[model samples]
Target: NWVHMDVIEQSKENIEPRKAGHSASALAKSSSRNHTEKEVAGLQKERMGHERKIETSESLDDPLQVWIDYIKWTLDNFPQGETKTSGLVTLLERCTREFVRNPLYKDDVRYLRIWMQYVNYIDEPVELFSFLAHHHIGQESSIFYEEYANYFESRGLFQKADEVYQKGKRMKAKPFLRFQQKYQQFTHRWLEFAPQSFSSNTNSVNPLQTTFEST
Candidate 1:
């Protein structure tokens, strides 16, 4: 039987607060320090340029027509946008377009998932999991058991780590595994799902939901 226990004590050296946390580690500091104002400004300018192109296209059409066109464009470009989408590029592009096209996209609290993906992949896996655990939707589950599992595996807690890995697999369950086989994400698994909460404040068994009604 797998060791049924938390493996939090392992891999402390590799563990650090993710940039999403209040106590991001030295790597976060280094990343911030390395960025020059000019580079950031350039990126901002490029972002604006992309916005301009989208805006120009919309301006050529009536408001309703423009939205219709955008919907079509999004479908052509982001076919799997609804489910099992993958990669930093798709994640980044879909998010960028969604926000630009619809101002109400901001109300989707799960948009933070985009930022979380960026920040989590910044440095180390342990930090990634730590950050995720901190922001786990309901704040009770999503303990980053895989990270802990791997950590303890290194610390001679192989059995415990295996248990954690199994649980982690379960915790990272998908809403539509059959659909996943068809449109599965090859890059980051987040196309699978994000941590989510319930209206009653109780932990939801299924984090990966089908109908996303962002209020």
Candidate 2:
């Protein structure tokens, strides 16, 4: 949503279309256009300075702050759509690579969650889920499993998603209602895609078999 808003704002500031039979006075039009260009140019220079700071940084200290600022600057300066999205993804990947290699904070759940969110944002569903499982991130949180199952189902892996939901249920993850709702939703979807003949035989449906090993 911020990206969308940024695109709209950027377009409004940078692009001006002359309406048929309705034109501003020549001097006024020139002044407005000049002001807009100056504003955008100033903004661009400020963002470039931020990039320079990151590139010239001498310390390997927590880059989370640097990456956060870079991402915000990128989205603010670039037009929406692929350019901003790609820039954000690039920064996220860089941040992950940097911080994950730091043994000091790699095990922190907050750091892992930030990486997980970015991973998901960049459409790395499988990698995100695997990383979460490997790190035992959100192992006790129902929302984590629910979201994971949803991601699986989104990719047409109904059975796998169902297995995740069932596993969560078996583990007795908290906020049982959320898990129950997701389980029912996945079950209903699977049934919808099930063959009519097989649907009649509930016994034919497989039970949850795969379990996630503790990290």
Candidate 3:
């Protein structure tokens, strides 16, 4: 990994302490001193140009590898934040669409897994969730339900989350045990933070109602 301690150490092995009179241009032009910096700049340029290359490719018969390469390049160049996440999601969406066109890869677990990971990087998961449901990808994996229900839970839709889990239960999805554990945790946390319920006789205001309304 470029960020690894050993890699960082190796990258600095050729650097010399700057003298008071050393020129910036001289250091910049040194072959050994700026090798890693130059390499990273070149890689970032290539990554930024990848979309153009993809658009102009003569043969797009197998786009998966191209998109995957682009994904890795983007990660290496911009690894910290949402700076490149939208681009990554777009590439993955195109890749998955192309991948599904070839019947040989439509149901391939690896292919589907790539799409699953793609969905995680997007702001709107429901778009990808609908896509997956349309394609029937991982129809039997409890992971789908867990992820979908988690989205609802994140939005504070506790009832909808429970409905999703119940639907997964009816389908006898694999890894339902994992879903159960997470569901328990989610509900427990919700209860701890959620305002207390009120009785019909009580004229007191419900804080939970205020919470939902405020949001």
Candidate 4:
């Protein structure tokens, strides 16, 4: 739930193609604890320096690395980023769109990784996931499939989760989850062994359920 909490609808307000957490109503406060005004100001100063570095490097060098570095730093410092006090959402949008000319970056894992963060803060996650799939980004990375299925599972979209899992298996991407994980994720979700309860998607009965039932 903490992961989902970061996806604020209004965080990207005024940006084209408006997303979900635009207002307090659609969002829960993400847990980053809280900061003192002085602490916040210190973070802001450092953040401003990084932002300036990104801009200055663009005029002088290949700003991609700068963007990557800055974004990483921002994530570390502002785990609760949104507005300029953190600017994580804004930084992600600009950074993702910044390297438009390089086909090289299209399938880059780091690029995909950054966008994954962007996805965490956006409204239409499925739309973005579809875009990544269509463009073949992160196809060779198991995280992409893992995340896609996890998203579906989080929403109780078992069938869709199954679909992505099937697709991910075929890719055989590096560092895949263990075999039990592959089997367990789907089975636990659909409750292939449980018989009663709309327990949502059920099959029949599961030995796993018996373990809990006895307790």
Each model's TM-score, in the order given? Answer: 0.25, 0.51, 0.52, 0.60
- List, residue by residue over 1-215, the lDDT tens digit for candidate 1: 33211322232233334333322232233233335788557645744554456566545533333433443333332222333421334544444344433443332334434433443334455554455445443122233343355355445554455454455455653323532332223112322232131112334377676676778
Clashes of 2: 0
Error of 4 at 64 (Å): 3.7
Clashing pairs in 1: none
Give the per-residue lDDT digits (tens) of candidate 2, residues 61-133.
6546666666555544442312542365666667666664455554455555456546556556777777766
For candidate 3, list the clashing residue pairs, or say none.
Answer: none
**Native-referenced Cα lDDT, model 4:** 0.66
- Candidate 3 lDDT for residue 62: 56
Q: Which parts of model 1 are misplaced by more than 4 Å?
A: 1-46, 50-121, 137-161, 169-172, 175-215
Off by over 4 Å in 3: 1-70, 81-87, 101-113, 120-123, 187-215
Please give the ranking of all candidate structures by lDDT, highest first, separated by commas.
Answer: 4, 3, 2, 1
| Prediction-by-prediction clash tally | 0, 0, 0, 8
Error of 1 at 147 (Å): 8.1
RMSD of each: 20.9, 12.5, 12.9, 11.7
**Model 2, poorest ten-residue lDDT window?**
18-27
Ranking by TM-score: 4, 3, 2, 1
lDDT of each: 0.39, 0.59, 0.60, 0.66
Question: Model 1: C-alpha RMSD to truth?
Answer: 20.9
- The candidate that achieves the highest lDDT relative to the unseen native structure: 4
